[PDB]
């Protein structure tokens, strides 16, 4: 009665592009070209696929299958599998809030850059502005110029002193106050995601049509543009030059594993929610396969889109694209690439489509990012929730805005690094390992192959059973152990993070998954009788 069965998706292509749009984001565009260039060049293509075939694809497919089979949220699905691990469904929620605290602000920057890209003369071309210093030296000026340790470029000046305004803060210690411009930008973004989420999967399935197809068009325009630029072969050479001695280093394998894990994004509850709304007899294998393989291919061509332009930039300057692509962060897009676009014909066009591309790269992923949590909460508190969806979605968008006010400060970029590298990563990897173990070693892999055999009509191959049993948990275990054994020393804009930053990162990191052990203790302490009977009634799913 009343609700009973849940709703279903409006078309196969909508869900196929929704998952693709969530999988593809900023990092696919710029993190993969950098990590591919600095870790063996073209030879990075070899371990990147292995970590996919053995690690990424099995987690992606197993998550999309569990989601499309059980049709439950990230929280209520554990009550029907392993109640003690229900805290997982909560942990991810908290995790999402941290991601949403910064991932949108980044887009805000692009948005503030987009609304600043409608002028006939781009603001970051000249030095006669209200934010430039006396060190600002630009081009279209007297030739012979020689760069100095204190000299700066109008683009670097525009990012540093105008939009980001990071010169007004001394670090994590002093970062206040808040920039109202980026607050309004992130409000507009939280509004464009509000009207794209508030109705449920109908609008995020209609809006995804645009958010997921535009980046390929923009990447195509930038691609055929950058291929025509003189001296673009240098960036391609630096992008594909095989350096097989890097493969001897045990670091590049960990870099590839981590990169393909985030980029694929299993273990977050997004694929669970997206798979939940679908036909029971609908095929899941082909969907997961195609989407992931596209997500990789798209990264691969994005590499060219970036390195052709950076090759042209190295030609205009003096070569060694590694020198011009030293900084691995937002500065590679907001300063370097932007300065390269400004020196091209129809600069307004390629700027509008570039920043618009960035925003459209981000939107689909935060759409999903919220979609998983909303689905989880609505499925965990039914009839206490779902009274309206707009109320909860609004409470989340607003919560993310107040959670992003720390990032909208002058030293907000500092917090972005802190949140992006020390907090979300190791916790998502941790909960992904816990989930992979619970589904593989608690619920039983044989019964899982039986559920896929019921849904798809055939039992999964031995390659996948042997992947879920041993290969995938060791795949996540390797990354977690590698990170925990040596957290990277953070540095951003000639500013090294204090030594206690990692403690703050761990505090944010630890505060996310306090619920899974405290919930195991909660259910283990609430259910009467012996601990063996409590863990037996707590590990085995509900019989009816």
């Amino acid at each position, epitope marked *: 009665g009343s609700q009973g069965e849940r709703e279903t998706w409006g078309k196969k292509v909508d869900f196929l592009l929704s998952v693709i749009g969530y999988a593809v984001d900023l990092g696919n565009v710029w993190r993969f070209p950098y990590i591919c260039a600095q870790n063996g060049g073209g030879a990075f293509l070899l371990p990147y696929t292995i970590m996919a075939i053995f690690g990424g694809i099995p987690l992606f497919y197993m998550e999309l299958a569990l989601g499309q089979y059980h049709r439950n949220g990230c929280i209520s699905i554990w009550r029907k599998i392993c109640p003690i691990f229900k805290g997982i469904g909560y942990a991810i929620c908290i995790i999402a809030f941290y991601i949403a605290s910064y991932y949108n602000t980044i887009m805000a920057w692009a948005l503030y850059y987009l609304i600043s890209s409608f002028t006939d003369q781009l603001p970051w071309t000249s030095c006669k502005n209200s934010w430039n210093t006396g060190n600002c030296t630009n081009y279209f000026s007297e030739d012979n110029i*020689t760069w100095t*340790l204190h000299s700066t470029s109008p683009a670097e000046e525009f990012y540093t002193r105008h939009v980001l305004q990071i010169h007004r803060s001394k670090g994590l210690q002093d970062l206040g106050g808040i920039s109202w411009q980026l607050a309004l930008c992130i409000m507009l973004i939280f509004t464009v995601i509000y009207f794209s989420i508030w109705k449920g999967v109908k609008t995020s399935g209609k809006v995804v049509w645009v958010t997921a197809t535009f980046p390929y068009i923009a990447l195509s325009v930038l691609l055929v543009r950058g291929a025509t630029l003189p001296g673009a072969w*240098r960036g391609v050479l630096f992008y594909l030059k095989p350096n097989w001695q890097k493969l001897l280093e045990t670091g590049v394998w960990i870099d590839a594993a981590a990169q393909i894990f985030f980029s694929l994004g299993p273990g977050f509850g997004v694929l669970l929610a997206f798979a939940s709304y679908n036909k029971f007899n609908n095929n899941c294998y082909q969907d997961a396969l195609v989407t992931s393989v596209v997500n990789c291919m798209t990264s691969f061509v994005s590499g060219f889109v970036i390195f052709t332009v950076l090759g042209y930039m190295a030609e205009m300057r003096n070569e060694d694209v590694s020198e011009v692509a030293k900084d691995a962060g937002p500065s590679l897009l907001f300063i370097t690439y932007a300065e390269a676009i400004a020196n091209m014909p129809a600069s307004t066009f390629f700027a509008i489509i570039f920043f618009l591309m960035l925003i459209t790269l981000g939107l689909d992923s935060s759409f999903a990012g919220l979609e998983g949590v909303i689905t989880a909460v609505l499925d965990e508190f039914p009839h206490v929730w779902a009274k309206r969806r707009e109320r909860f979605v609004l409470a989340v968008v607003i919560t993310c805005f107040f959670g992003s006010l720390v990032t909208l400060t002058f030293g907000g970029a500092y917090v972005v690094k802190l949140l992006e590298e020390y907090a979300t990563g190791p916790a998502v990897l941790t909960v992904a390992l816990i989930e992979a173990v619970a589904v593989s070693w608690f619920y039983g892999i044989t019964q899982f192959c039986r559920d896929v055999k019921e849904m798809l009509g055939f039992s999964p191959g031995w390659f996948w059973r042997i992947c879920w049993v041993a290969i995938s948990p060791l795949f996540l275990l390797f990354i977690i152990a590698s990170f925990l054994m040596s957290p990277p020393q953070l540095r951003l804009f000639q500013y090294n993070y204090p030594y206690w930053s990692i403690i703050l990162g761990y505090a944010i990191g630890t505060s996310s998954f306090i619920c899974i052990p405290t919930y195991i203790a909660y259910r283990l302490i609430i259910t009467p009788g012996t601990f063996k009977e409590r863990i037996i009634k707590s590990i085995t799913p509900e019989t009816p």
Partner: antibody
Amino acid sequence: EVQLQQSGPELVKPGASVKISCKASGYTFTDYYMNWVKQSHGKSLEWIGNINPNNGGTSYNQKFKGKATLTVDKSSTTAYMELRSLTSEDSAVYYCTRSPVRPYYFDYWGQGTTLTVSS
Amino acid sequence: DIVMTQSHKFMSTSVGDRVSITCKASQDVSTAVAWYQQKPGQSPKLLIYSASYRYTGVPDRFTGSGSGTDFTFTISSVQAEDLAVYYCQQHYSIPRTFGGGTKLEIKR
């Protein structure tokens, strides 16, 4: 004008260490990278590494990693290079030369330091 | 790394003749080549930077040409005080390497 005055010649026994100074004048010391070029007897020039005077931002060569240590002092605008584990190959003339960030040319050099590693 | 190869270790010329020294690089360099002059007993002195551009305080008789991998340093009127060892050096990729050196001996 722009003058880079190094230290005098040094005769040191093999296995010891030696430090060479580089007093700069005639320009804004905090504006340019400070470099060190090794020139062997009858050989070509060999860039050892540079250092950023503002914070001591060193950048050595893979061939000199663990061989040379570059330091800098802003209070007196003077650079230093220390060499440990001295052998017969280190007996050469060392220069310290000023250089901008881009284009990376060596506009002004020091007079040189004749190093002799022998017992 | 980059290998700056000066094939001619020694070159003979006369006072007033046109002399040109060649410099061969490993990979493509665009226009990132500097020419230094080291007189016997003195420190190297920068003459050319970025292939063709002359530095301040350098006579007009010293020129530079080339665009790619092979570069040429040209002296129009050789003087008696031009007797020195000439070095070429790339300034694009880390590390910065030098050439073998061409001791320009004067024939009379």
